Ligand binder design. Structure first.
Ligand SMILES: [Cu+2]
Ligand SMILES: [Cu+2]
Ligand SMILES: [Cu+2]
Ligand SMILES: [Cu+2]
Ligand SMILES: [Cu+2]
Ligand SMILES: [Cu+2]
Lengths: 337, 337, 337
């Protein structure tokens, strides 16, 4: 609370990892409050988002879409050093939905190419929160170009269920969902531009339709399927953090459920249970806990099946272990009528 | 647990009924776990969804859109014999969101025309869940062709409110909301086809716009009105189950309320109370308990009034009873200004 | 119960104020149950919804979009004298979501131009509820023309958190969010019509797209900005009631949080806490309680950033007070890299 106390707190640098993987942390806080330091360089680059070679001039924190997940405990201070290289052509900033004041920090971190800034904030509330770039006048554009992520502020004493009973996960994954608005020419072919700003006008026209051309996980159609599927084993407890900085989503683990789901993302708000499909509004993050019971492949999707299977909002989970015939059994395999 | 133990469980064959009605069942489980058997034949047929003669090539479970509601209690086993007659042209399967393993069953139930299969799963979680067809690579198409429904896994001891008091209903209705995407020719007239597959290409383009041409209850505009209006009486406690396998909905009982609403559809997640309009994400089912206090006709709708009154999402309830002037009264009937 | 017992109740006529302000009231009920009287005259008037001059023929209760907020206590009787002037061309009625019977009151208040009516209903359920016009056959047209508002039925003992601790706000604002569907000409310019009737056909075509041309607060793009910006101070407890009679919204106070959010708008439903972005389904109202901690400008928006910053759903908050460096601080201001 006092100047003396804050300045005396321990400083601790963390090495970030690209989604859907998460950096090192302890569910239960180790030691007292500390100033957790992170650093992210902003990269403006063209990325291919589908099998048709469709490009997007990405604006990515730490070079990834979405930005990496930052994990701190309640009442710690998140001190982030944001850098916008001279090679970039736009001004960026950052808004932490977890922070209080200055529009989430957006007003204190507006950096042009060739600048860096250091913002500190006390994570006073526990939950998963979205963070995103918000330069005044072109907020949506930056956000829908991939410039968003989320952070997890864990209660000092780890997660718990509705009746105070502790919930300890074995694995944690971060799925950032992105709605893209790529322009098409009169023939229907997606367009490519030299610089980010060149697409500005055409993109906004697409944005106003409120109909994304692609809705993806980890920046691309299929980014989390195939060999890039997330893993687990029967018996394993998994926390799947999910975010959507600009548009609603309805997550669903096909084959499983969300045993405990902090749908609003706030840990002080009791988790719903036995969820089939949960809902996360635009501009929020949510977290679902589940203990795998059956092996095989699972499909984790946005349950608007058109957005999942036509637009690209589908990921996989490869689970190992033994099958349970009490849970499910093929009494009579598909056979002649 | 052991196959031996399950084999010794009493089995019961249940007779399914067309929505909005629900087959006979007991709120409080009568006895120990049983293996509840059901049989549904898949019927591919043309359905007329509006008074303009618009046709949809439905892929209907048990012949109706939505498929019938199956009722079992927690920890019972639901055994379904799914049949895909040789009269059909497509492979179909079934995913129960209430089940655990093999993508909810779809992976163990892929039956081509002229095949059948039998699936058994333990209803481990109490609540209303969605079920739907989901052929690999043709998922949304089958779902938006009306191939979906719901099941209700009641708690053994029946329904209860957040504080444990028993909530016993007098009537139950199942309302399945469907979002259709019907192609139109260059003149804005809805197109008709001679075969399901002939409309595939045309339908996928409409689906991608994420804008349904129709949003209807029980398969057609006006389906649940007039001869198909739901009934009740002042003093009657009614449970309205609602499902939407592909798209969000916001149910509303015009003139009444949602006394208790399990918005997520999961009974272990306490119900919201005194609701005016509840929300159900695409891919889930919710349930609302309400005791009618006033006679007259009510209108149950998706409260995006455009969807409800332009697109077709509206149903009626004809309630009998005595008017309660304490609740509402016309002090001055419409008259001179 | 009896008309004699209701007539023996004290009556109090209330003078309404234009949104975002609310007429005077007490959080805790002043004594016992009373019949609270209100009067509103319907005005069909042209309004301008943006800086380019886009006009809409609105259907406004009390001449405002949204209609004013009426405030009463649970078990009070709300007696509304609704007047439809001779200068109006259409018939109108009102559906109170807080009421029980005759389609929320709509069936008993159908008045033509030149008529008036007086409806009384008991405010039996505590919470915020929208009210809107619903002429049979033209329900959505009236609503998306601005003919909706909201009411608040406070618990007779004022607000409390989910654990019983009292929640008393210092100020209260009412944000009515409106989705408009404005036709455009062949050049993309918004169209103007002589009579509201002349706008119907073209407007219906846009409504069916389910993509509004404007999403605004208090009737217009930027209505709640500049000298019309809401105000507060550090330490000030603010209750923000938000409604959307026809379309979903997801409120977010950029730079702040929703400390206690009755997202379903029903006070008997415990509030969520520490919310970053909440959700209010079309056809409902919600309420958020927040104690300001930092000074400066805040943007209160619907967090689908395209809706917020392209469609018009952004309001501002001007907050006085001392900056809190503990909560947030610029360790290094934007500077050389
Ligand atoms: Cu940026
Ligand atoms: Cu934001
Ligand atoms: Cu099928
Ligand atoms: Cu599914
Ligand atoms: Cu009207
Ligand atoms: Cu309504």
């Amino acid at each position: 609370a006092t100047a003396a106390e804050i300045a005396a707190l321990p400083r601790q640098k963390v090495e970030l990892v690209d989604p859907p993987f998460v950096h090192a942390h302890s569910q239960v806080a180790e030691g007292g409050p500390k100033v957790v330091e992170f650093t992210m360089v902003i990269e403006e680059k063209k990325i291919v988002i589908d099998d048709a070679g469709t490009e997007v001039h990405a604006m990515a924190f730490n070079g990834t879409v979405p930005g990496p997940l930052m994990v701190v405990h309640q009442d710690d201070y998140l001190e982030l050093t944001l850098i916008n290289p001279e090679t970039n052509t736009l001004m960026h900033n950052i808004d932490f939905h977890a922070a209080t004041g200055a529009l989430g920090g957006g007003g204190l971190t507006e950096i042009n190419p060739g600048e860096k800034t250091i913002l500190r904030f006390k994570a006073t509330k526990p939950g998963v929160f979205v963070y995103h770039c918000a330069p005044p006048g072109m907020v949506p554009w930056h956000v829908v170009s991939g410039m968003n992520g989320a952070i997890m502020v864990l209660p000092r004493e780890g997660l718990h269920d509705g009746k105070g009973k502790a919930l300890t996960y074995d694995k944690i994954y971060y799925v950032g969902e992105q709605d893209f608005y790529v322009p098409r020419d009169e023939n229907g072919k997606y367009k490519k531009y030299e610089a980010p700003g060149d697409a500005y006008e055409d993109t906004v026209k697409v944005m106003r339709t409120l109909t994304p051309t692609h809705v993806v996980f980890n920046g691309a159609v299929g980014a989390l399927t195939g060999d890039k599927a997330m893993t687990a084993a029967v018996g394993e407890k998994v926390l799947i953090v999910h975010s959507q900085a600009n548009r609603d989503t309805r997550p669903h683990l096909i084959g499983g459920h969300g045993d405990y789901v902090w749908a609003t993302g706030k840990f002080n708000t009791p988790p719903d249970v036995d969820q089939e499909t949960w809902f996360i509004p635009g501009g929020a993050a949510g977290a679902a806990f589940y203990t795998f019971q059956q092996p095989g492949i699972y499909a984790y999707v946005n349950h608007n099946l058109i957005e999942a299977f036509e637009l690209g909002a589908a990921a996989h989970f490869k689970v190992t272990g033994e099958w349970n015939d009490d849970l499910m059994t093929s009494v009579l395999a598909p056979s002649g009528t």
